[PDB]
Specification:
The chain has two domains: about 160 residues, de novo design (two linked rop proteins) (Up-down Bundle); about 90 residues, Glutaredoxin. The chain is about 60% helix and about 5% strand. The protein has ten helices and six strands, in the order ααββαααααβαβαββα. It has a four-stranded mixed sheet. A two-stranded antiparallel sheet has the order 1-2. The longest helix is centred in the middle third of the chain and has 30 residues. The protein starts with a helix and ends in a 7-residue tail after the last helix. The PDB classes it as oxidoreductase. Keywords: oxidoreductase, Membrane. The assembly is monomeric.
């Protein structure tokens, strides 16, 4: 009944899973077109999936390997004393992080991925076992959980807000300039690279002419307006008759739109 063997197994599965995703995220032949995703890459490769300069999966790797090591180590310095309180800290942080991950899928991304879902259940499995695999005689644990979860959520949310650069100085003027010449952006709301392009403008993207190519969602035939323009992939810029496909920096969009970049 009392066992840390299951922790090593669940953390073992977790370590393989999250290590494989790093490999897919790391090898990752780079692309912007994202022409073809049913799928899972649509949820996955969302910025949100990068954390502090490294893949989110690599963070879970530090975690899943962390919990594994605490379970495997024999009771050595500082282990018997700090083993189980450090397990409740690390796992609590992992559950909290996951509930935010779960929140992103259901609410903001409105989609799912089986790799990501398996990790939740693995961590939910870790949370149950850690609670029922040691004796700490009560209200301490319920409070220690909220403390760690709170610190985790604040740090997590804080990083994903400090993740994006705010409006570039060129951004504001360009957006108004494209609005005048009718430089339009064709893309989707689910499209991760459209989000990347959106984030390069910031709040100034309100000014940018944007056509939703698929209002109904993924898997559905794209809207008429985009089909008339021959849009095969997202995002796609049409500026002064010219066609530019993929994410473009503010500098490159300014060149296409004829927006003066003066430094003299």
């Amino acid at each position: 009944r009392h066992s840390r063997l299951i922790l090593a197994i669940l953390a073992g599965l977790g370590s393989l899973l999250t290590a494989y995703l790093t490999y897919t995220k790391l090898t990752e032949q780079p692309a912007a077109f994202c022409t073809g995703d049913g799928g899972c890459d649509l949820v996955l490769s969302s910025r949100w999936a990068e954390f502090l300069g490294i893949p989110t999966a690599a963070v879970g790797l530090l975690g899943f390997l962390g919990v594994l090591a605490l379970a495997v180590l024999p009771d050595l310095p500082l282990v018997k004393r700090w083993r189980w309180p450090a397990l409740f800290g690390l796992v609590s942080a992992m559950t909290a992080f996951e509930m935010y991950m779960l929140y992103l899928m259901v609410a903001v991304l409105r989609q799912f991925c089986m790799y990501c879902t398996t990790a939740i259940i693995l961590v939910a499995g870790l949370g149950l076992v850690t609670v029922l695999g040691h004796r700490w005689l009560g209200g301490k644990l319920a409070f220690s959980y909220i403390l760690v979860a709170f610190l985790t959520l604040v740090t997590t949310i804080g990083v994903y807000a400090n993740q994006v650069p705010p409006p570039s100085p060129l951004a504001v003027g360009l957006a108004a300039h494209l609005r005048q010449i009718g430089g339009t952006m064709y893309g989707a709301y689910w499209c991760p690279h459209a989000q990347d392009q959106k984030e390069l403008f910031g709040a100034a993207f309100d000014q940018v002419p944007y056509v939703e190519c698929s209002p109904n969602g993924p898997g559905t035939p794209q809207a008429q307006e985009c089909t008339e323009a021959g849009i095969t992939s997202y995002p796609t810029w049409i500026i002064n008759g010219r066609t530019y496909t993929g994410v473009r920096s503010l500098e490159a969009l300014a060149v296409a739109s004829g927006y003066p970049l003066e430094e003299g």
